[PDB]
Amino acid sequence: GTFLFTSESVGEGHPDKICDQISDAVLDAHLQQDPDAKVACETVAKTGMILLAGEITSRAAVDYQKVVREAVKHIGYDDSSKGFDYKTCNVLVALEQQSPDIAQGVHLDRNEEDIGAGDQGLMFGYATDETEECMPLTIVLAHKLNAKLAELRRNGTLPWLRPDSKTQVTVQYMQDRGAVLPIRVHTIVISVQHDEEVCLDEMRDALKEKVIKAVVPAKYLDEDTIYHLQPSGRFVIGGPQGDAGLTGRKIIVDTYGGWGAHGGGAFSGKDYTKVDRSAAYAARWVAKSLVKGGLCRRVLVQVSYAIGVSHPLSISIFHYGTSQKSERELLEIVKKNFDLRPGVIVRDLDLKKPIYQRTAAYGHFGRDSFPWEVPKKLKY
Amino acid sequence: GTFLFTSESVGEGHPDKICDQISDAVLDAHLQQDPDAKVACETVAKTGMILLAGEITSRAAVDYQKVVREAVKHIGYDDSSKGFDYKTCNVLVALEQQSPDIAQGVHLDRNEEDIGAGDQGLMFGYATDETEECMPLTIVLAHKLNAKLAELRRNGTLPWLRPDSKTQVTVQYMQDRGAVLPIRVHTIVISVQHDEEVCLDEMRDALKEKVIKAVVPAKYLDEDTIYHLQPSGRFVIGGPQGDAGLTGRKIIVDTYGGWGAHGGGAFSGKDYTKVDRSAAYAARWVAKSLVKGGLCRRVLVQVSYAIGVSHPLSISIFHYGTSQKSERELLEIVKKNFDLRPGVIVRDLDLKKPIYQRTAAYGHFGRDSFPWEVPKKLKY
Ligand SMILES: C[S@@+](CC[C@H](N)C(=O)[O-])C[C@H]1O[C@@H](n2cnc3c(N)ncnc32)[C@H](O)[C@@H]1O
Ligand SMILES: C[S@@+](CC[C@H](N)C(=O)[O-])C[C@H]1O[C@@H](n2cnc3c(N)ncnc32)[C@H](O)[C@@H]1O
Ligand SMILES: COc1nc(-c2ccccc2)c2cc(Cl)ccc2n1
Ligand SMILES: COc1nc(-c2ccccc2)c2cc(Cl)ccc2n1
């Protein structure tokens, strides 16, 4: 009855994640001045370049050069020896106003509660009781391994570390009446960019002793656990120099690590009218509310929208057999407790607040008691 | 016991899909001259611009301006009245060689069968017996609605159509011992870019009569079916002018429309050593082989890799309760029948062949008897 499952995460300096953080730094800069800014900011990163491309209609006066460079500085790319430098990189801007055809069909002359979805699409929310934060253990451990690397880099413990990293965790689970129970860690992968001076054996020993052992409980690790530490053997070239990054290329890292489902929409660089983000956050909120409310142990929620229409086109619930209530009954509880119009979600989840850059690394879910992580008390 | 499920698709002129097709046109151009080209081509599209960013090491001599412009011409953006023109757009190239650190860790001095995975990651394959092509009905119908729009545009039936479109289909299903049975179409959305002269009522009537009725069997449509046709009310501005596109931003449209699972990796612009593509194609091949082989009615396959390591780190099978065999037994059949090393998948699926641009619109699965769509006869 056991099986393996794998999830990955990436560090703050992974080039796709750099793009997500810059896109959300731009969004936050606009929201600080104009809470009703319409933002759809994509970022591309390659050797020496940050390009912003997209559509913004806002009353804010934003200094893109400063916002971009400050986000790159925060990540840690501050010298050409690291392959990228916020002080000296090229920042190119190809931003236009939001299409007037979209604006007229979505929000112009609309009451805020009755604003239309900013696009069509489908979105999922997921929650599992296998961890207190209601997230899959595989993804939680993968994120914590990247956060540990960043901590040891920033505190000077492992000064050879650079910001670009990837991790991957394979857990052996037991099936339990639809719920899943973690047994042990089967395999861990860590790849991290490093300086030219450190040797492979020093890195592998540090990754095991100072990173894995500092994150993964010893009860999950045994003589059979497989470790792939710096498996490529050399990772000096990294960040955008090693691989082009784009916003919205880590959507599974951002969500549930392969568990649940995904509707395809990226989160970063988008204001609340883009249901790709707001409805995915609301769906997580619903799923977590169902699990923390004791209605099920594991649950998947789907919602969908049409551009210009406020109410969802569909809502579906899948409880994996982990509820005594039928899926039809859970759907009725959801419909009685939640209003998934984007103009209502914005109020419930305070989505005009400029906290988005905080979401753009280490996953959008299962952390920091964001509004979508605080369960709603259900009435039924 | 019924539920709703929604999937979407996009047209050839949707800006993200333009990027996927250009990335795969570049890949195919290199493979035509150098079957061992190492390609990681990302494309960005915004008003008047195609930018190529990424890493290519190849012996081919490729004219990027010609390859890009020919792909845009094929899509149909050939005049400034349509918002984009292959003849006059800007084509910018920011392509470098593949990182030597990656090359040495993945393929340099390696026997082809024993080449390492080009990155870490997780990938899923999925198959369902609900259609002959073993794909979810929601996604099949959504893709066919975009293909119909392109057909009617190209044959001059609806000369007001432009290349950028999106569709979305909600189906009401019945649960059947883990398998799913389509009952009826609950909701359809169609949004398509159009000329300045056609009125909304003419478009809505044509979308219902000439598009939906030409694609969706009447048995699925009834008096209760909801139609959202041109729901924004106006879609003259479109293509990259309306919304920035990027490669690998339609990964759910490319795969299973929300069904199954996704590991996060994009397909387009990558050669076979990038397991994001080759292992996802092999996982589809495994899943389809299990369903067509009569071992299950519905199945999800996960595989994962570490950069530089040839064999998968994990393989998992989930049959939704649709097999008499346990998941452990199906996993043993898979392990006896398939070799999921990338240097073996390349041979089985003929992945050096330049057919990739054909995959980059209307989904990578369930069409045209590509090698990953031809089931393997299983021995057990
Ligand atoms: C391996 S690269 C992707 C493939 C690459 N575009 C190519 O040209 O082959 C993907 C991610 O892996 C990481 N990476 C880059 N260079 C690496 C190296 N030498 N060893 C391990 N991981 C590396 C970085 O996080 C990078 O964004
Ligand atoms: C609605 S746009 C995304 C949001 C946009 N970036 C913004 O600035 O609000 C996403 C996709 O919807 C389609 N689209 C663009 N303009 C549209 C319109 N006026 N009505 C309906 N769909 C539209 C195109 O396929 C486009 O790529
Ligand atoms: C026990 O639940 C469960 N769920 C899944 C699952 C994961 C993601 C999306 C949908 C289902 C699963 C997947 C594999 Cl490959 C193997 C065993 C599994 N067991
Ligand atoms: C009967 O199978 C099934 N599967 C799913 C499912 C879809 C994608 C990924 C994993 C599971 C499902 C999802 C919803 Cl929201 C509602 C009912 C459902 N029924």
CB contact under 8 A, A8 and B264: yes
* Helices and strands per DSSP (H, E), number in chain B: 10, 13
| Nearest alpha-carbon partner for B314 in B331, B327, B298 | B331
- From the list B84, B124, B235, B338, the catalytic residue is B235
**Roughly how many angstroms between the first and final C-alpha of chain B, as a whole number?**
35
**A-chain residues near B308 (CB < 8 A):** 231-233
For residue B202, the SS3 value is helix
3-state class of A207 per DSSP? helix
Is B14 annotated in the active site?
yes
The rounded distance, in Å, linking the Cα atoms of A140 and A122 is 25
Spatial contact of A156 and A299, defined as CB atoms under 8 Å apart:
no
Structure tokens at A38: 């319409």
**Residues whose beta carbon lies within 6 Å of some atom of ligand 4:** A 261, 300, 302, 316, 318; B 3, 175, 180, 258-259
Cβ within 8 Å, pair A231-B51? no
Structure tokens at A98: 């939001």
Q: Which residues contact A274 (CB under 8 A, 6 or more apart)?
A: A40, A118, A119, A265
Name the nearest CA neighbour of A92 among A61, A46, A34: A46
Minimal CA–CA distance to A304: which of A277, A275, A284? A275
**What does the alpha-carbon distance between residue A339 and residue A344 come to, in Å, rounded to a whole number?**
6
Ramachandran region of residue A350, left (φ > 0), alpha (ψ -120 to 50) or beta? left
Q: How far is CA A168 from CA A175, A185, A229, A364, in A?
A: 22, 11, 10, 18
Rounded CA-CA distance A240/A91 in Å is 13
Strand residues in A177-310 grouped as ranges (E): 179-194, 226-229, 245-246, 298-305
User: CA distances (Å), A111 to each of A25, A30, A129, A134, B287, in order?
Assistant: 28, 22, 38, 35, 48
- The domain defined by B2-9+137-236 folds into GMP Synthetase; Chain A, domain 3 (3.30.300)
Would the CB atoms of A306 and B247 count as touching at under 8 Å? Answer: no
The interaxial angle of helices B64-75 and B15-33, nearest 10 deg, is: 130
- Determine if residue B270 is labeled as part of a ligand binding site: yes
- The arrangement of strands across the sheet holding A49-57 comes to A90-96, A49-57, A38-46, A245-246
Bridge partners of A79? A84
The Å distance, Cα A152 to ligand 4 centre, comes to: 41
Residues A74 and A67 sit within 8 Å (Cβ to Cβ): no
Closest CA to A128 of A309, A296, A327, A303: A296
Beta-bridge partners for B7: B169
Query: Measured between alpha carbons, how far is residue A81 from residues A66, A190, A194, A202 in Å?
Result: 22, 22, 10, 20
Side-chain-side CA neighbours of residue A255 (13 Å): 34
In this structure, what are the phi and psi dihedrals at residue B347, rounded to the nearest 5 degrees? -75, -50
Asked if B152 and B211 count as a contact pair (C-beta separation under 8 A), the reply is yes
Residue that is written with structure tokens 């290199």 in the block? B30
Fold of A2-9+137-238: GMP Synthetase; Chain A, domain 3 (3.30.300)
Contact between B234 and A105 under an 8 Å Cβ cutoff? The reply is yes
Indicate the top mutation candidate among B139, B259, B318, B320 to test ligand 4's pocket, ranked by most ligand atoms within 8 A of CB: B259
List A127's β-bridge partners, or say none: A299
- Which residues precede a break in chain A, with C-to-N distance above 2.5 Å? none
Q: Are residues B70 and B86 in contact, defined by beta-carbon separation less than 8 angstroms?
A: yes
Residues having CB closer than 6 A to ligand 1 are A 14-15, 164, 166, 191, 232, 234-235, 238, 242-243; B 40, 55, 98-99, 101-102, 105, 118-119, 307
Q: How many residues can be counted in chain A?
A: 380
Query: Hey, which residues of A are catalytic here?
Result: 14, 16-17, 42, 55, 166, 235, 243-244, 249-250, 270, 274, 276
Query: Is A131 strand, coil or helix?
Result: coil
Q: How many residues appear in chain B?
A: 380
Give A17→chain B minimum CA distance, Å.
Answer: 13
Out of A102, A247, A270, A278, give the residue to mutate to test ligand 2, the one with the largest number of ligand atoms within 8 Å of its CB.
Answer: A102
Domain ranges for chain A = 2-9+137-238
Q: For A328, name the nearest residue in chain B, comparing CA atoms only.
A: B1
Cβ neighbours of A49 in B, within 8 Å: 94
Respond yes or no: is residue B235 known to be catalytic: yes
Q: Any catalytic annotation for residue B271?
A: no
Which residue type, as a one-letter code, is found at position A238?
A: G
Cα of A95 vs its chain's centroid, Å: 24
Question: Which has the closest alpha carbon to A193: A219, A155, A232, A221?
Answer: A232
Using CA atoms, how far apart are residues B105 and B118, in angstroms rounded to an integer? 8
Contact B13, B28 (CB under 8 A): no
> Which run of H or E residues covers position B31?
helix B15-33
| CB neighbours of residue B215 within 10 Å | 20
Strand partners, A93: A52
CB B367 within 8 A of CB B359: no
Rg (CA), chain A: 21
Token pair recorded at residue B225: 């079916």
Token readout for A331 is 């759907």
Is A16 within 8 Å of B128 (Cβ atoms)? Answer: no
The resolution in Å comes to: 1.0
Helix, strand, coil tally for chain A in percent (to 5)? 35, 25, 40
* Edge-to-edge strands, sheet with A161-176: A2-10, A161-176, A179-194, A226-229
Contacts of A233 in chain B (CB under 8 A): 104-105, 308
Distance CA(A299)–CA(A318), nearest Å, equals 6
Which position has the token pair 């236009």?
Answer: A96
> Which of A55, A250, A302 lies closest to B243 in CB terms?
A55
- What number of C-beta contacts closer than 8 Å exist between A and B? 255
Yes or no: say if B184 and B220 are a contact pair by the CB < 8 Å rule. yes
- In angstroms, what separates the C-alpha of B377 from chain A's closest C-alpha? 25
B343-368 b/e (C-beta count within 10 Å ≥ 16 → b): bbbbebbebeebebbebbbbbbbbbe
Q: Beta strand pairing status for B49-57 and B90-96? A: parallel
Strands, sheet with A314-318, edge to edge from the N-terminal-most edge strand: A121-128, A298-305, A314-318
- Longest CA–CA separation in chain A, Å: 65
> From the centroid of its chain, how far is CA A159?
27
